[PDB]
Amino acid sequence: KSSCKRHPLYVDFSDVGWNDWIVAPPGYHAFYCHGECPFPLADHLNSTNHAIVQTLVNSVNSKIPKACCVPTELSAISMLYLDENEKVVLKNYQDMVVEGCGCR
Amino acid sequence: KSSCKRHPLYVDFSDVGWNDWIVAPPGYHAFYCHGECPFPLADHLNSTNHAIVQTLVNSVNSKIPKACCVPTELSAISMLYLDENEKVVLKNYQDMVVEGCGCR
Amino acid sequence: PHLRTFKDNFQTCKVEGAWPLIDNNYLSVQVTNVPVVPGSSATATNKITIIFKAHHGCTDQKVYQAVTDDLPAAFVDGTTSGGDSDAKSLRIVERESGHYVEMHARYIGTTVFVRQVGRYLTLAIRMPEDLAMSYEESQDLQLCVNGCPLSERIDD
Amino acid sequence: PHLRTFKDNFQTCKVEGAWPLIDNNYLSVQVTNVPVVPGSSATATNKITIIFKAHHGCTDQKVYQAVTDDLPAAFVDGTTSGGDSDAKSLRIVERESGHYVEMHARYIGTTVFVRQVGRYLTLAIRMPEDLAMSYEESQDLQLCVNGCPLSERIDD
Amino acid sequence: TPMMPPVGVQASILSHDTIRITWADNSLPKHQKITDSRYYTVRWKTNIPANTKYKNANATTLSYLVTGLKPNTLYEFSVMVTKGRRSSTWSMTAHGATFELVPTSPPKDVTVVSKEGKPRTIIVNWQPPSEANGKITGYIIYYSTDVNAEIHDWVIEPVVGNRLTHQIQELTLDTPYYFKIQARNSKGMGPMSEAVQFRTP
Amino acid sequence: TPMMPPVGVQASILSHDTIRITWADNSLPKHQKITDSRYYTVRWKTNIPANTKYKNANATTLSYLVTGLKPNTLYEFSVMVTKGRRSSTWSMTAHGATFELVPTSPPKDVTVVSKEGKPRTIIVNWQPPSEANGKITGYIIYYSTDVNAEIHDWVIEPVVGNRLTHQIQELTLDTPYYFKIQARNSKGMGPMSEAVQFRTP
Amino acid sequence: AQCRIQKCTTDFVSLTSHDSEFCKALRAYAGCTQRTSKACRGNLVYHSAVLGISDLMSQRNCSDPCNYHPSYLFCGLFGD
Amino acid sequence: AQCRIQKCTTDFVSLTSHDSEFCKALRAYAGCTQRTSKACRGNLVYHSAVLGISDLMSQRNCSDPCNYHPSYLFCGLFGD
Ligand SMILES: *[C@@H]1O[C@H](CO)[C@@H](O[C@@H]2O[C@H](CO)[C@@H](O[C@@H]3O[C@H](CO)[C@@H](O)[C@H](O)[C@@H]3O)[C@H](O)[C@H]2NC(C)=O)[C@H](O)[C@H]1NC(C)=O
Ligand SMILES: *[C@@H]1O[C@H](CO)[C@@H](O[C@@H]2O[C@H](CO)[C@@H](O[C@@H]3O[C@H](CO)[C@@H](O)[C@H](O)[C@@H]3O)[C@H](O)[C@H]2NC(C)=O)[C@H](O)[C@H]1NC(C)=O
């Protein structure tokens, strides 16, 4: 009884043990998806036909589980680290931040 | 302690209540994904950087949940139904069958 | 065949072919008759059709038809009753283990019977006075109301 | 300055500039000396360097250096000991609340002392006989072994 | 001792000639499986015409496709199971009724006469088509003095669906007229009846 | 009554001049938050040279970047918290040691003399560079009779890292020679020493 | 120009976000779908939605007159 | 030509699929990663893997000699 949404999540690289390699940033806002995928929502989209068929199957036979709340759209962010020579590298990491959730 | 895999699932359209509209087939093999996404697997791919960052966060703070086992590759199938005039329509439905699972 | 009109008088008529006994705002009854022996003037009835016309909210249209050797206890559409599930405003029943059937149109206080006698059909109708007379004019040709046209009568 | 050799004899030498007291397979000791008054032949020591050469599995290389008014209780790299955590095969200690430091190289039974006296440094070494003599030849110039070259001596 | 009958029997109408029947067997492990050499027998009938006897089908699936039905007709359906020697009685009977089809026979028994007292007026009586295939929403009367005139050049007279007699006024005396009628329903117009010849007095 | 000190203090070496310190405060709600006007004070020092005094930094984050450190040098690190009036004592001290850098000063105290008994042989003594910046893996001795000769035309003599004296044999008598030395470590070659002039007998 | 089930769903969702609380909006959604009915003939989202609504229709459970009113006449046609 | 962490993971996975059961293969995986170490300098999968292995390294927990051997000499250099 939450329903599939995006929730915030700031990853502190000290807290996670990446601060030995990432010069910057100190951490980033990754977010995460969480919540249930019921009879209208998994319909609602973004959802795959499969997700629809699955949630419908769940509705008949609850041994088969409902679809899952996951990131359906993500963005990239840039980060900094050092090369062999202690010189900076700026590198763009795909699929880091959740821009949208959905059922799959 | 299962780990994210594909499991079989045949959707019987009588059993689901689509047999009033789908002339053929009687049902289809949709499959579904299920299983956990631990420290090597969510690494293993197909997985999004985010999924990796999330499972790593889970490992520090289990209040944030692990990534989710979902279909990462799907196929289409054709189905038959009748038009206004009781004439057949063959229609190709995208994302019906799970061809692969992964963590997201 | 032998006709008894609403007005309580008998007539024997040829009326070979298709003929309306009733044709009013509520009901139509149509008979096909045919010579009892070839080249004869005396006739009998081999087809009987009834149309219970739609009465808003009570029954949709239903149609009984029977012919020599096919005397069903249902309307053409396979049903045995009209409209509402709870209301039997119109229903049809088999009687005398199949040898005749009767239709109760409660909504128009009308009762209709159809029977097979040997190779032909008899028909009987009981109907409220006013509703019988409801027919619009120039819709005048109804045998039950006016009788046979004189030309179609055996007794000169 | 005043030199006491391994062989137990004294000498007073000029040896101005950079000079090796020891230079063998285990240890190097290097001093920079300078005239005690300008234009004088009599000298004193203002820099002392020691290199504890790497002994496979016991310590990696370490280096002590001290100079007038900078007499640390650590090696150049900031550490206070060599290699193994559990083994103090080589360690350095402050003594006389800082006025001299001593180095215990257990691995080569060698003890070295460095002290500040006014504006200069004294040095003392105690070393096993065999290991002292381990130096390869044409590596002959070690003051502790052979003494000063005659030309570098104050007492003709 | 006696095997339960199948339950939850449903018809899903698919076309004017075709309905799918489905049913459940509580006998079997749920959601769902068939694992043994049992079979289902499906039966179906209507009331028209009088005294139809049942039709049968054997099936190893919990669904059967009933084809070749009359249009606009209500059918009833029931199922029994058999497993080797043991059979069940029949299920709860479930009903389902086929969609309409355009009519496919002409109106029957076209009968024409002159009106009593007025000879310039004639009366057409007829009977509905035996293959009406749906609720008759009207008829169309065609007439001509030239029986061979192209059909679109005949006089066309629309007529309501619930009347089997109709009056046409204002004709010529001592004249052969010819008549055809046709039926219509929600799905279109049926075939034309044979021309019937009548001569005014 | 007395505030706990921060714990779990770690150094992560990032470069020859730079280490990041991180620490934990059990005082705070876990995994994680900072919510009040408290602050952390970070201190750091080495042993070289003799009697360095500590360096300080105030920080409102559980991480601090310590810059401008000497290469190849071990540093120690500790943290205390303060909240208005109350402060804590210092944390468990944690150590971390900067990476190497190519040397940046020349060798010092280059001293040249002729060998006793053999005048065609000379002896070079020196002292390591004060900015060695890493374990010295060797030196290189340069010499020429022409002090102005281009550096690549001088005689080049490689030498091991752990010897501060070396012999060069087979020279000409009554001859001015000039000498430069340079240091090398795992990261490369340092600058050349000033030329020192010496004349054979 | 085609199946507008997407609109029915969104509208329903908004109303639900805000006893027979749901049931007002369920019956509305159900009407909506039936109105885009024939456009959605082969549409997977529609056919699921349909069963989806009626699933929720179960939880909570949502969603003299003809007899003639005094004498009669009789007509008949008989064989002998 | 670049970070081969993908191989370390797959190899590890196969071995695990098949007390110090894991720990044989964990220590192997850990070696593997350290060997592709410098190629994976900015690689997200590598840096997670590293912590990932050492996470599992905790559960189950996996993974006279120098003193001189008899007389001495002395040398010194003194100021006065
Ligand atoms: C539907 O399935 C039933 C049940 O399996 C079928 O019934 C079986 O039909 C055959 C052929 O009529 C019967 O054969 C018998 O053969 C002997 C001679 O060998 C003869 O004496 C018989 O009177 C009979 O014809 C068989 O016994 C019978 N079995 C049962 C249990 O009824 C049925 O044929 C199937 N039919 C349809 C139309 O779906
Ligand atoms: C790091 O943070 C500490 C704690 O906040 C700072 O200590 C504060 O520093 C100021 C400046 O030294 C002190 O000011 C005082 O001013 C009066 C005159 O108004 C004078 O009599 C003093 O002796 C003193 O200078 C302030 O009292 C002091 N507070 C505390 C609690 O120590 C410190 O300055 C920061 N420094 C660095 C280098 O990070």
UniProtKB/Swiss-Prot annotation, chains A, B:
UniProt superkingdom:
Eukaryota
Q: Where in the cell is it found?
A: Secreted
- Which ranges form a coiled coil? none
- Tell me the tissue specificity: Particularly abundant in lung, spleen and colon and in low but significant levels in heart, brain, placenta, liver, skeletal muscle, kidney, pancreas, prostate, ovary and small intestine.
Where is this chain glycosylated? Answer: 46
Q: Which cysteines bridge via disulfide bonds?
A: 4-69, 33-101, 37-103
Family the UniProt entry places it in:
Belongs to the TGF-beta family.
The subunit structure is:
Homodimer; disulfide-linked. Interacts with SOSTDC1. Interacts with GREM2, RGMA, RGMB and RGMC. Interacts with ASPN. Interacts with MAFP5. Interacts with FBN1 (via N-terminal domain) and FBN2. Interacts with type I receptor BMPR1A. Interacts with type II receptor BMPR2. Interacts with SCUBE3. Interacts with TNFAIP6 (primarily via Link domain); this interaction is inhibited by hyaluronan. Interacts with ERFE. Interacts with BMPR1A/ALK3; the interaction may induce HAMP expression.
- Tell me the function of this protein: Growth factor of the TGF-beta superfamily that plays essential roles in many developmental processes, including cardiogenesis, neurogenesis, and osteogenesis. Induces cartilage and bone formation. Initiates the canonical BMP signaling cascade by associating with type I receptor BMPR1A and type II receptor BMPR2. Once all three components are bound together in a complex at the cell surface, BMPR2 phosphorylates and activates BMPR1A. In turn, BMPR1A propagates signal by phosphorylating SMAD1/5/8 that travel to the nucleus and act as activators and repressors of transcription of target genes.
What name is this protein filed under? Answer: Bone morphogenetic protein 2
Name its species. Homo sapiens (Human)
Lineage, uppermost ranks:
Eukaryota, Metazoa, Chordata, Craniata, Vertebrata
From Swiss-Prot, chains E, F:
Where's the Fibronectin type-III domain? Answer: 5-104, 106-201
Source superkingdom: Eukaryota
Sugar-modified residues: 58
Q: Which organs or tissues contain this protein?
A: Widely expressed.
Q: Which family does it belong to?
A: Belongs to the immunoglobulin superfamily. DCC family.
Q: How are the domains described in the entry?
A: The Fibronectin repeats 5 and 6 mediate interaction with RGM family molecules.
Q: What do we know about how this protein assembles, alone or with others? A: Interacts with BMP2, BMP4, BMP6, and BMP7. Interacts with RGMA and RGMB. Interacts with MYO10.
The entry's protein name is: Neogenin
> Whole protein: which stretch is covered?
883 to 1083 of 1492
UniProtKB/Swiss-Prot annotation, chains G, H:
Q: How is it modified after translation?
A: GPI-anchored. Autocatalytically cleaved at low pH; the two chains remain linked via two disulfide bonds.
Subcellular location(s) per record: Cell membrane; Membrane raft
Positions glycosylated per UniProt? 61
Describe its function. Member of the repulsive guidance molecule (RGM) family that contributes to the patterning of the developing nervous system. Acts as a bone morphogenetic protein (BMP) coreceptor that potentiates BMP signaling. Promotes neuronal adhesion. May inhibit neurite outgrowth.
Spell out the family assignment given in the record's similarity comment: Belongs to the repulsive guidance molecule (RGM) family.
Q: Give the record's subunit note.
A: Homooligomer. Interacts with DRGX. Interacts with BMP2 and BMP4. Interacts with the BMP type I receptors ACVR1, BMPR1A and BMPR1B and with the BMP type II receptor ACVR2B. The functional complex with its receptor NEO1/neogenin appears to be a heterotetramer with a 2:2 stoichiometry, RGM molecules acting as staples that bring two NEO1 receptors together without interacting themselves, this arrangement leads to activation of downstream signaling via RhoA.
Query: What is the name attached to this protein's record?
Result: Repulsive guidance molecule B
Which organism is this protein's natural source?
Homo sapiens
Q: List the gene name.
A: RGMB
